[PDB]
Amino acid sequence: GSHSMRYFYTAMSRPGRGEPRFIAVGYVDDTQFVRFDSDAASPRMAPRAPWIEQEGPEYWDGETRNMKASAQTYRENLRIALRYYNQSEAGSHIIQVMYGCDVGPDGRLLRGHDQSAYDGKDYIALNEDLSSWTAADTAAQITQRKWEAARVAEQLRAYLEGLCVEWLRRYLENGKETLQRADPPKTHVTHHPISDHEATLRCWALGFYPAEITLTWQRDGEDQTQDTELVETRPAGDRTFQKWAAVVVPSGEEQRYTCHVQHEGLPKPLTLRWE
């Protein structure tokens, strides 16, 4: 199947409470495999998945050195953002960054990503061509000008087409038993009377990996989008995810409703009904 590697950085200022906290996490698909937190007693890139533990001291030392340098860069970027947005040194602000690569079954680059946000709003993003930028506002246009002068997109493109895809291929091989295993959802329909007139039908999907899933209700074969309550996919804590979709149905009409489930782990989409 198709796979991704993504790093997520968060830098948060907290004036009067020390220097900004910097936390980085790395994922392969929906599996976290590394973390770095400047607030740890001894900040270090640390393993969070069993398949990365085999990496040697040169890996952990190199990643730690890079993370400590990124923490310093993002603390500087938070100072620069105050100047670009005419903001005071008194408030708490956040920079977020997400970058990485997507590969297909053959491991070739499908797409690269490198984007950032300030205070939860898009700031600048590397375009799909890996050669130009999209700036969200006039402050990001200043960074865009700096980065075009410095040929930053070329450096990012080299990482995304090179080291990013090479290391993602390595992690997929090292973690093949889990990263390359889809766990299909365990599904069932529950029934909860609301009153004498109505009942809730809830379609459950449990124990699935990766997180991407489609759960829908139909009535007489028509999708019930507006009338369906659909919870956000949620982690179970054992690598898997859960989701449910519910509809309020008139008493005795339960058999008109069917739940439809699609997931990578299912060779064919499933149809379920109450009992």
């Binding site: 890139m45 860069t73 670009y84 700096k146 450096q155 990012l156």
Partner: peptide, 6 residues
């Protein structure tokens, strides 16, 4: 594996 100011 992980990878200029604003």
């Amino acid at each position: 594996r992980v990878k200029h100011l604003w």
